[PDB]
Amino acid sequence: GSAKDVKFGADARALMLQGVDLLADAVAVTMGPKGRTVIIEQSWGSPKVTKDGVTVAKSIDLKDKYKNIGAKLVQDVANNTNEEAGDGTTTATVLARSIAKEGFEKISKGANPVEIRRGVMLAVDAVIAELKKQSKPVTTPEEIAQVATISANGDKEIGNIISDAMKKVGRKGVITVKDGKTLNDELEIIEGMKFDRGYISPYFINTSKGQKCEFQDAYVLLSEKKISSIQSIVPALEIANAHRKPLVIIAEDVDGEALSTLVLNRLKVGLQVVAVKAPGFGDNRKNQLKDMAIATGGAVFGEEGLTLNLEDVQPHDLGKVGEVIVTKDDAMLLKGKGDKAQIEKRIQEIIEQLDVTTSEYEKEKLNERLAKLSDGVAVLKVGGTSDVEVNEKKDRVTDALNATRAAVEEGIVLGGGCALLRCIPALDSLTPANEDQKIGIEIIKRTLKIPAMTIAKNAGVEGSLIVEKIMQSSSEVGYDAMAGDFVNMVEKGIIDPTKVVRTALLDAAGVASLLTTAEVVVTEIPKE
Amino acid sequence: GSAKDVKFGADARALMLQGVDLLADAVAVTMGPKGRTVIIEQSWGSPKVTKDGVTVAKSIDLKDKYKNIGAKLVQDVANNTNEEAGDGTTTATVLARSIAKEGFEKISKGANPVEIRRGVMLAVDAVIAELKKQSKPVTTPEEIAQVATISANGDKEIGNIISDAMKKVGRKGVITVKDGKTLNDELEIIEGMKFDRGYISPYFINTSKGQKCEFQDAYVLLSEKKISSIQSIVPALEIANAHRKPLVIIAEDVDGEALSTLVLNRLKVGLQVVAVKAPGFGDNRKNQLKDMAIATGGAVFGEEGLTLNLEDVQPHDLGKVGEVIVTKDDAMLLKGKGDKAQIEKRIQEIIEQLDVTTSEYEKEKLNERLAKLSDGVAVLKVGGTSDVEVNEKKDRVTDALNATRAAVEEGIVLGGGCALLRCIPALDSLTPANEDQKIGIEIIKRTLKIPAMTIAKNAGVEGSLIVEKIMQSSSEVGYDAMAGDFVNMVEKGIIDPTKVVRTALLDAAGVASLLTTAEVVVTEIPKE
Amino acid sequence: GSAKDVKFGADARALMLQGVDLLADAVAVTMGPKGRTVIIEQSWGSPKVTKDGVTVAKSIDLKDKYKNIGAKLVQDVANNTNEEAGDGTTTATVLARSIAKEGFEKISKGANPVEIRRGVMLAVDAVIAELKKQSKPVTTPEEIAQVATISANGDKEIGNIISDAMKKVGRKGVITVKDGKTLNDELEIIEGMKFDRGYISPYFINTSKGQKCEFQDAYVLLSEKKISSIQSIVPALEIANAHRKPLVIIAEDVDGEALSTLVLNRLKVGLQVVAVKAPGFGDNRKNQLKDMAIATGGAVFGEEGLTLNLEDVQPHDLGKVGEVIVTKDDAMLLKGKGDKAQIEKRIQEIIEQLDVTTSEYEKEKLNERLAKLSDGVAVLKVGGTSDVEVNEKKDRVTDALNATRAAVEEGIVLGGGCALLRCIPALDSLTPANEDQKIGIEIIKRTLKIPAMTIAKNAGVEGSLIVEKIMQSSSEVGYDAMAGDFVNMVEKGIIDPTKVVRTALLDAAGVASLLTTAEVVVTEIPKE
Numbered sequence A, B, C: 001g002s003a004k005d006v007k008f009g010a011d012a013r014a015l016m017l018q019g020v021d022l023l024a025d026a027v028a029v030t031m032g033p034k035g036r037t038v039i040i041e042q043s044w045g046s047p048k049v050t051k052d053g054v055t056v057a058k059s060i061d062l063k064d065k066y067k068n069i070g071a072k073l074v075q076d077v078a079n080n081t082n083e084e085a086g087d088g089t090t091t092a093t094v095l096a097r098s099i100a101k102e103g104f105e106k107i108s109k110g111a112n113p114v115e116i117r118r119g120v121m122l123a124v125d126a127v128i129a130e131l132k133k134q135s136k137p138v139t140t141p142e143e144i145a146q147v148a149t150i151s152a153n154g155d156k157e158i159g160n161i162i163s164d165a166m167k168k169v170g171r172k173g174v175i176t177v178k179d180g181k182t183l184n185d186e187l188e189i190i191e192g193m194k195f196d197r198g199y200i201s202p203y204f205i206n207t208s209k210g211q212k213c214e215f216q217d218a219y220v221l222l223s224e225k226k227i228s229s230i231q232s233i234v235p236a237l238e239i240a241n242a243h244r245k246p247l248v249i250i251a252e253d254v255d256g257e258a259l260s261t262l263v264l265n266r267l268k269v270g271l272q273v274v275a276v277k278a279p280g281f282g283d284n285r286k287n288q289l290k291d292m293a294i295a296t297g298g299a300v301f302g303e304e305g306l307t308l309n310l311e312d313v314q315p316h317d318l319g320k321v322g323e324v325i326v327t328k329d330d331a332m333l334l335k336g337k338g339d340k341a342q343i344e345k346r347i348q349e350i351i352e353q354l355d356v357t358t359s360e361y362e363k364e365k366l367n368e369r370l371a372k373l374s375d376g377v378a379v380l381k382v383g384g385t386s387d388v389e390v391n392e393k394k395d396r397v398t399d400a401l402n403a404t405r406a407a408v409e410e411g412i413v414l415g416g417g418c419a420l421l422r423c424i425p426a427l428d429s430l431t432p433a434n435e436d437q438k439i440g441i442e443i444i445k446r447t448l449k450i451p452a453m454t455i456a457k458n459a460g461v462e463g464s465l466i467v468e469k470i471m472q473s474s475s476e477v478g479y480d481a482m483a484g485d486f487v488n489m490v491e492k493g494i495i496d497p498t499k500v501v502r503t504a505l506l507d508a509a510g511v512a513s514l515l516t517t518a519e520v521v522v523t524e525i526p527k528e
């Protein structure tokens, strides 16, 4: 144990609050429109450029120990808010700073900080209840378009793109974004059962195009194991040639000898066939082959429990699809006739599975299979020209996407902070058990006015003035910063998710209130 | 041997006392309500936040050698108190500091410190005897609820939860806490014989649910060895299919070949079976499978001494239970018909075992088997939102739990330090052998007033005033700090364990009195 | 995470702008004629000497962190411009600096930088549209000659050489430059099917010259596999000797035993034969052998798909060419009679391939095969007497080549910056959505006058004067710096690619406008 150092009372309080104020002034700019980006130095390549408040937050590290403690207690709020709701980081940080500063003023010699924490918790409960009461669900895609248009920092193309994605894939589809290439954004819909793996032999190339193999109404072979012996591969090709239709071979791997047979019958007379390996790592590829068989209609081969030997295959034992396309690094199955009721039951199985089980990575490929079997997958290849532009725009896009998915399931509320200001009468409605909880109530009451204050600040206007004049106005009337005036939000097209707001408020309030009761700080000696 | 340094008399005394005063001022706040947390810097992640006095104590390390010696002699008191009674750390630290300070004033050139130690020991004996005489056992669960409500730092939910745990599991049940997930705490009762291990083949999945296998009134197979040959596994399945009932296979491990037979008969016609490995890791499994067999009623297979070959099994040789459920990571046995007198005798065996043998880890799994066979196991999944909130609340909960278990077996006393103040007349009843023992007696007499003094200090009130006015009052009347006034404690619902008080007092008195006789200190030179 | 440092507002802005001004003053000289070279210190040898703006750019690294950030944001613009269009680096850097400086003046407390970025983007769109409208395609080789003559920094020999290369190879041929060896430049045309590998045995040397093997109308043998057994090699030589014509053996490798047979029949009776291995790669060598077979006219041997054993070869199964010559390190095939329609279809295959697929190293060897089959690649040896002169002249030549290839496909425009000045009325034609976009528009409007200003500066003349007097003049009239006066450019023979201009402008505008919105900079502490 390294020799440590201790500090008491107002000293440690002032140092920690200074550190938190440093970290929070670093970030509080990036709220709403008129916020301003932040450049961080990447140690190896180009620096990062952001508006996000966790890259900003998680990047900051302070030399002094106590200020470092402040920075850590802010970054934990940021990180929890991120991992819980994805967006609402800046709000978390600013509310945390305000709550901490208010806490480090009522710390008397007669006050009991734990009661302060309790009262803060009561306030948070009351305000979150008032939020959920004043929420409202999302129904029309106009609301989705609006929310997405917001969370790109006021970009409308992002809103339209996410709207079209959620419409052509469904409100619980699987959309994902990749680093775009061209100057502009792109919304691609990977439809059908498609996956990253190309035709093994470049002799199946019947496309007269960029390395494609195109079949129509072809049969399918689905082996969990490899295909080594000629005796194994031969009867399948026999049945295919008897029917005189193209054949796909989705299996673990193709022997060079059966491959030689294939290429022999392909170069000359030309038995329409094609060879492709399995989809993925271990068990996941097994389940995916099962799903592929049940989708196309047929039966997986190479089983353990029944094992379905290839020697005895049958014309109703093959996978059948309308069209198949293969490119050197991926293939697509289109019209698998797989007993739509049966695939429905499969879907119900895997959906109850995801409902019960999840690990944030299990459920990832879970929904992967769901979307790959039911309705496409949306990719969002973005514009941009520099890597830093790419990172910026992609960050904003992903943030908007997470906000939209949070808003689709749980209700929305009037944007621009108006919800909390409307919830303040709830705080006026509480009755504290004693003085200390009332102190905490007044702390949260002051805190609720903080965010719109910060926003008006960023706009370059009078914070408290705008906050008061908003509180005087109606329930739905509030302040736009872009138009710099008062309007109805939903009329104007500004709303926000309820889940993001509630999670951010809860995280910030909890961590800051816990921080307040600190009395004595111990730190490592500054040796090295 | 590194070159060292020596110091004599008042110098070394003052340095060690300065170090101990640093370490004890660091902690003395965290007593009773109105105590205040401490933030410690974790070297790698988020800082810790505490009220406990050993994290605080064990964290502190001083640059200067002599102050380091003081810190070590305080941390040893803290650590002994923890490992002995679990709670009573802060009290140990404060009493140790007060005893040390009183000791480093009577150190004359004519005084004999060893006699001082002797007198202190006599005082401690008298006071602990007076404690145990004025103790009183715990009878009703209201006392348990009260005590738990205290030791969450005045939280009532913790009290109610621990009370319900001890009621639904018994005053010597096995309750344990894990890092909760949701916003709120949770009291879960793992009942029956349940253990962390999932069904091997995901073909036994008859639940139509999140990866469950549910059987009712199924037979059991219990092998200490693996199940490789088809000849070995076959007769069991024969008997099960003859009776036409589901079967569980609890064994070391299942061959892929017998597994293939199982999956064959399961996918088609569907002999109700299920495969699960052995719960215990090592010899613990060698006992646990025996216990499982005797619980369900049957006989373990794969024995060494009789070895019970699987080829000749019998319908009365199987484990029989009412219901069985298996997840992907654990399963539960419910209604094992295992000769309740016989399981009783087994329980008596293992309980006499724990009574005789223990290693703090042997006896752990010992009570594990006891509770798993007799009445459930209580888990206490906690609330919280941040990792630091989790650590804080879990620490307080575990402390309350340890205090409750200490109080259930050995008597309780009036809380808020009143017991020692009531025991002071015992010190007024002693007769010293000579002057020095009388000096030690007066030392302990002053010491006994220290804690309530510190508590009133934390409250923000006059220490000696409150101590005196309490001493003037009745035996059961004392001071609440939350109501900041005088009440009857047991009337008010404040009590404490006698074991915690006695152990803390004994540890602090012993180590501090030993410290007092120090005359000359030697330290490592400060090279590196 | 190392302890970091933060800076706000005007401070970080001033530091980053100082760094960018350092890096841009380092480079801005090297534009047009009268630009001046830059010497960089190579850490292990002779230093580099350049006019390029990415050796200068990528070399510069600043001690101070913030200035380093400025340098990185400039080098990224330079590198993107390079990797996109190859030339137009200096223009990118200077436009970036001007845009950055203009940005770090309108940064008020009321201004919204994101709107500034938006307006800049609108300006860039308008200007690029006006460029493409005022472009014009390249038709006559005079234009190519002029462009190349420019981009060697006004060298005419470079222009003539690149013109002759593109004429004798076609506007989409494959020209490449290598480090010359003589005093002067040299344009070599590798025609026929030639590749780096020499005759294995130096007994086939019938040239009476510097290690050559010359055959006329010889047969060809093409094995994908080695040639080990005498039985394998013997029938080919049998057929060749029956026809009584020389034979080439292009295969994986020659056995020492078949080699012994060859040398036996060579030193004695004098069979005409020659042995050469494959090109030597992986799949690329197999494709090249296939193309060689289809070029000469014949069947590749050692195939996997269709075996084509050497034992049964046929007089129409051999590769046939007009003339073959072999060195010790490369050989050339001439007049391969390979079914010109068939080779045409092959060309169409590989060209659709390149049209669809590319990886910047796949399409490289792709065009390699295209040219090697249809038009001999043009190499450019550079004549210089110092290694540093070699690097300088070669850099300028490669830049001129890249500029020419960019200009051949996409249109050209009047050189010497006149295009942007002519596009400024487009900026006068826009209507901003609000004030901020108008600010950005005026930013770009000022920016467009920057480059010609810098050029007149380098010339030693009055920048703004020349810019204004050009703007007063006609559309096609502008300023030469070499003649230091006004002329018509296309009349005078100055033009430039539209792609270079558009890409440079776009990159610089994008990255600089993104940089403008920075508000807070975070850097690593300067520890080490």
Ligand SMILES: Nc1ncnc2c1ncn2[C@@H]1O[C@H](COP(=O)(O)OP(=O)(O)O)[C@@H](O)[C@H]1O
Residues within 6 Å of the ligand: A030, A031, A032, A033, A052, A053, A087, A088, A089, A090, A091, A092, A150, A154, A415, A416, A417, A479, A480, A481, A482, A494, A496
């Ligand atoms: N035009 C707008 N006018 C008024 N308020 C807005 C506007 N756009 C966004 N906001 C508000 O600002 C917030 C966006 O700030 P943001 O960058 O997302 O910080 P965080 O990452 O913590 O969510 C939204 O919650 C919204 O209420």
Ligand SMILES: Nc1ncnc2c1ncn2[C@@H]1O[C@H](COP(=O)(O)OP(=O)(O)O)[C@@H](O)[C@H]1O
Residues within 6 Å of the ligand: B030, B031, B032, B033, B052, B053, B087, B088, B089, B090, B091, B092, B150, B154, B415, B416, B417, B479, B480, B481, B482, B494, B496
């Ligand atoms: N409401 C209360 N009013 C008066 N005394 C209390 C109250 N709650 C706890 N105490 C007293 O304070 C002590 C709790 O201090 P504690 O945090 O447990 O320090 P330690 O870890 O050394 O036990 C109890 O022994 C009790 O006598």
Ligand SMILES: Nc1ncnc2c1ncn2[C@@H]1O[C@H](COP(=O)(O)OP(=O)(O)O)[C@@H](O)[C@H]1O
Residues within 6 Å of the ligand: C030, C031, C032, C033, C052, C053, C087, C088, C089, C090, C091, C092, C150, C154, C415, C416, C417, C479, C480, C481, C482, C494, C496
């Ligand atoms: N003799 C010339 N007279 C007028 N303008 C010229 C002349 N030569 C080049 N230029 C102009 O200057 C530019 C050449 O600068 P350059 O060295 O190519 O910088 P960069 O590498 O960024 O392209 C050309 O785009 C051209 O418009």
Ligand SMILES: [Mg+2]
Residues within 6 Å of the ligand: A087, A088, A089, A090, A399
């Ligand atoms: Mg946000």
Ligand SMILES: [Mg+2]
Residues within 6 Å of the ligand: B087, B088, B089, B090, B399
């Ligand atoms: Mg305690």
Ligand SMILES: [Mg+2]
Residues within 6 Å of the ligand: C087, C088, C089, C090, C399
């Ligand atoms: Mg150039």
